[PDB]
Amino acid sequence: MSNMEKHLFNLKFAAKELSRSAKKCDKEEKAEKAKIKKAIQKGNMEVARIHAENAIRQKNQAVNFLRMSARVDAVAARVQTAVTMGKVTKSMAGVVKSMDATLKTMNLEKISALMDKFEHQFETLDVQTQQMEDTVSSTTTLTTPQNQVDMLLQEMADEAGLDLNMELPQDELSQRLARLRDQV
Amino acid sequence: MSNMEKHLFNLKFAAKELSRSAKKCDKEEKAEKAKIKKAIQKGNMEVARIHAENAIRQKNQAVNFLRMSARVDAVAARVQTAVTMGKVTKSMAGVVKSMDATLKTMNLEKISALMDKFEHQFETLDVQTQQMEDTVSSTTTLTTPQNQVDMLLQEMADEAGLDLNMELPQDELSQRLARLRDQV
Amino acid sequence: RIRVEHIIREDYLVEAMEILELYCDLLLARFGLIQSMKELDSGLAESVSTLIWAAPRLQSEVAELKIVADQLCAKYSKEYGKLCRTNQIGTVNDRLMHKLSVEAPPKILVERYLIEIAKNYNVPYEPDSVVMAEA
């Protein structure tokens, strides 16, 4: 617990202690009022006056405690802002320091390099997959004759009612831009 | 327990002790009154008078204890203010001292600097995210052809009844203020 | 009036950033020439000189722009770099130099800004009669 969190804890506690003191005074104004009535009915006017002075005293104590509690709450509410905004400021300071370190060790030029290398190394893995698959294809050529695959596709297309002939080797902006390159 | 909290504890205790003494006197006025009646019925006028003098004595003791209890409460209520307002004053003194230290070590010029650095370092992280995403985009260009995405958007828009054509590349104060800059 | 001077300057700066973005993209498009020749081409002279001129003004915001300028000076020599920074080379883009000037906006521009902003937000405003007359 921080030195300021201790002070906030004590201010919150004092505010509640004053609020309880106001509640105790109010409940004792009610208790003393009951005793005035009893003393009047018994004709004990001296004792009635002692209770009357207690009732009016605890009525006024209650307002003073209530008012002080309100003031100590207002102060406790402000030190809460100071405690929380301190925690936020230290966390931001820490983030700034951490990111300053990582932006040094991996600056944008180094990121640029790493991303270029990443892309170029997956181009190479595409070249490698292609030639593994071309090898496997030639390896098992006799297990998949071309004409048998073509005929199975045509049969399944006929069943589906699809008009596309499957034996055959089955954008204009690109074509026009090509014609421009030839024309110049 | 503070030296003043001890005094408050003893004042609160004395106030209750006097209040109990008043209650004991009242209950013994009732007890002695009962004994007067018994003595009168038995014709023991000397014993009746002894009880009568006790009854009137304890009636008057009760008022003196009640009055003293009220006065000691009034004093106990004031030392409660002094104890509580002392705790509040020390806590405020402590807050002032703590904040004086932190406002030195992190003054507003230093905060200004830290906030500038924070903002500028997140500009850099935006530049870095952008070029990671541009790399990944170019890396997997063949997995997402533009025309296929456009056609899927148009198909889903047709189903939704939305009129916006999705193949195409789909404020006036800014425009007018620009025209002003050109006119001067 | 004094708050719109900040807005005018930021608006001019955004327009200047668009011009520099275009010249960097031009040096990338014609990067073959930069790397090939040892002489500076005419087509690139505007772009190269302007980027060297702008870097000391902008390098607070755009830190990499310093490195671009330093490399272009290493390529075409320090002396060319000095002739650029003063525009003795007479090739730096005029509109950009205007847009990054330190001079205060004209009073009539400030008034016209307030008129347009006031109109847009439906706020009553009466412009400075002296300024509107001087225009």
Q: Hey, are the CB atoms on C15 and B177 less than 8 Å from each other?
A: no
| Residue from B171, B180, B182 whose CB has the most chain C CBs within 10 Å, to mutate | B180
* Alpha carbon distance C104, B102 (integer Å): 40
What are the C-alpha distances in Å from A46 to residues A34, A43, C120? 15, 9, 79
For residue C113, the tally of other CB atoms under 10 A from its CB is: 22
Q: State this model's resolution in angstroms.
A: 3.0
Chain mean position to CA B134: 50
* Alpha carbon distance A3, C67 (integer Å): 48
Question: Is the CB of residue C50 less than 8 Å from the CB of residue C20?
Answer: yes
Q: Hey, are the CB atoms on B180 and C116 less than 8 Å from each other?
A: yes
Neighbouring chains to A with at least 3 Cβ pairs closer than 8 Å: B
Q: Which of C22, C96, C26, C21 is nearest to C62 (CA)?
A: C21
Gaps after which residues in chain A, C–N over 2.5 Å? 170
Residues with Cβ within 8 Å of B176's Cβ and at least 6 positions away in sequence, in order, are C116
Q: What is the DSSP letter of C100?
A: T
CA distance A71 to chain B (A): 10
Q: Over the range B11-36, which residues count as b (16 or more CB within 10 Å of their CB) and which as e? A: bbebbeebbebbeebbebbeebbebb
What are the C-alpha distances in Å from B140 to residues A115, A121, B145? 13, 13, 9
Q: Which of C86, C68, C77, C81 is nearest to C23 (CA)?
A: C68
Question: Is the CB of residue C132 less than 8 Å from the CB of residue C108?
Answer: yes
Question: Is the CB of residue A79 less than 8 Å from the CB of residue A4?
Answer: yes
CA distance C116 to chain B (A): 7
| Amino acid at position A91, single letter | S
Q: What is the DSSP letter of B161?
A: T
Closest in C11, C109, C117 to B184, CB measured: C109
What are the C-alpha distances in Å from B122 to residues A99, B96, B125, C59, C63? 9, 35, 5, 17, 14
Q: Which of A114, C19, A92 is nearest to B128 (CA)?
A: A114
CA neighbours within 13 Å on the CB side: how many for C44?
A: 21
Question: Position of tokens 């772009």?
Answer: C47
Query: Maximum Cα–Cα distance for chain B, whole Å?
Result: 126
Q: CB-based contact (8 Å) between A109 and chain B?
A: no
For residue B51, the tally of other CB atoms under 10 A from its CB is: 20
* Alpha carbon distance B95, A10 (integer Å): 11
* Alpha carbon distance B46, A38 (integer Å): 32
* Alpha carbon distance A56, B74 (integer Å): 12
* Alpha carbon distance C46, C54 (integer Å): 12
Question: Position of tokens 């509410």?
Answer: A77
Q: Hey, are the CB atoms on A115 and B99 less than 8 Å from each other?
A: no
